[PDB]
Amino acid sequence: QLNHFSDVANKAANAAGDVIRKYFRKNNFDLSPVTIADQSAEEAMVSVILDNFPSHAVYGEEKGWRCKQDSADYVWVLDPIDGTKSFITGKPLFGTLIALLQNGTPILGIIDQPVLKERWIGITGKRTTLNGQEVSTRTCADLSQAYLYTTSPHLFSGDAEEAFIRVRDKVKIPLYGCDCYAYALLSSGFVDLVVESGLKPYDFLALIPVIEGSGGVITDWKGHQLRWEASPLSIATSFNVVAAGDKQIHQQALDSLQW
Amino acid sequence: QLNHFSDVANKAANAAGDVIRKYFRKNNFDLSPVTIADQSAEEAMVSVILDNFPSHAVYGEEKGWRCKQDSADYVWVLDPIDGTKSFITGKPLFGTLIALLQNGTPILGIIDQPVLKERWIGITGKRTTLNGQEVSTRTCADLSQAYLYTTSPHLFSGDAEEAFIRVRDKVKIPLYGCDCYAYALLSSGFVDLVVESGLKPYDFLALIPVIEGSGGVITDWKGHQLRWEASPLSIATSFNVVAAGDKQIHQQALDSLQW
Ligand SMILES: N[C@H](CO)Cc1c[nH]c[nH+]1
């Protein structure tokens, strides 16, 4: 069953990537391609998921929870295009995110960059892979040595901005720009810390098996389990995320955030 | 002669890309690959340039001006890896920059992304191309509608920070992260404005023919010609750059910068 879930997840990603490639870089003139692409890619992923698993649920931004039954043990939580600003501006560092949750816990995550043809797959029980090769996070001696990413300086509001700044000022260097891709880099051992505020569950659940299966750590800003039980009544509110390659760095970050 | 300059520039870029690909993503463990790569790639570019053009000069960050004669009409100004933070962190949006200057004016520029296999070529007299296909900037109705990039919020010091903020607050959205790649996106019509402070000449001269040959505008923050006459005594100081797809946007930006 678990290899069947992986095979179907890969089929979904293959379909989404062809759709997305059709619309990327079409907008260089003075519904938009990104909206069509998101919708069409989601439909292509859902269609193959539900053909293979009619008892499963799906969850996406626009349509919410959908299931032919009142309830489901298995829920696919999808974002065809995480990083729509990158997509719209022609930058190939957006990703397609696919998570499969069993009783609310992610058991499979994919980060797919269809232009670069890079696919990270996290599966509970397995080491994370990139294009079929195992990857690992790296150690990092101290927060002062850590390479930090976040999408944008402007995506922190209120007290979260002050907390971010506390961590930001302590790392080796803060870098910006690319949504889920930074977490993929962390999982491959090229980034030490990612700290973001205001992620919806379809933009973080796929990250969890990827990072954890690479040896990293990902929690909310209090260090609690990042969790969202997709259900008919779950609310897609936004969460604060901190991911690290090294658990000691993670703790240092938590101590600076003071959330 | 001009097609010979283009052929040799492409040979140089082909050599640099193979060198860089050898060292990219080797640093996922707990002289570095980026330093070796930069040095080796520069040497590979210089070696083919000077074999083809022994009367020419070359200019690079580490070695400065080099020429077998006291003077040269033609000077190649190179940066093997613009975006070393991206390179070090495994992000494939650094670029190799090659500029050829005749009497101090760029006549050829290349932006090469060797992982993505994307090459923008600007040649005076020709429309800019990406992988051999002509590209163009796009129009933009007003600064309020403009997509803006800059590498980092932290790369503005002093009065330049205040000037940046004046423009930043007026655009549709400010985005971050990727060095020369944003200028390539502008030249292809996917970005409207790029505003940066503190670029060395080896990181902007190649941009000029690329952007101008796409229909865009690139100047210093006073709207003056961005120029650096590479010579035995030229100082590689840093410059402020503003590039736009549309000349009306460019003017609006200048008016906000108030430099
Ligand atoms: N990838 C996320 C959704 O586009 C970016 C983000 C960061 N913080 C809040 N939102």
Ligand SMILES: N[C@H](CO)Cc1c[nH]c[nH+]1
């Ligand atoms: N690509 C440039 C050199 O890495 C980035 C930069 C922006 N402003 C100052 N420096």
Ligand SMILES: [Cl-]
């Ligand atoms: Cl089923």
Ligand SMILES: [Cl-]
């Ligand atoms: Cl010669």
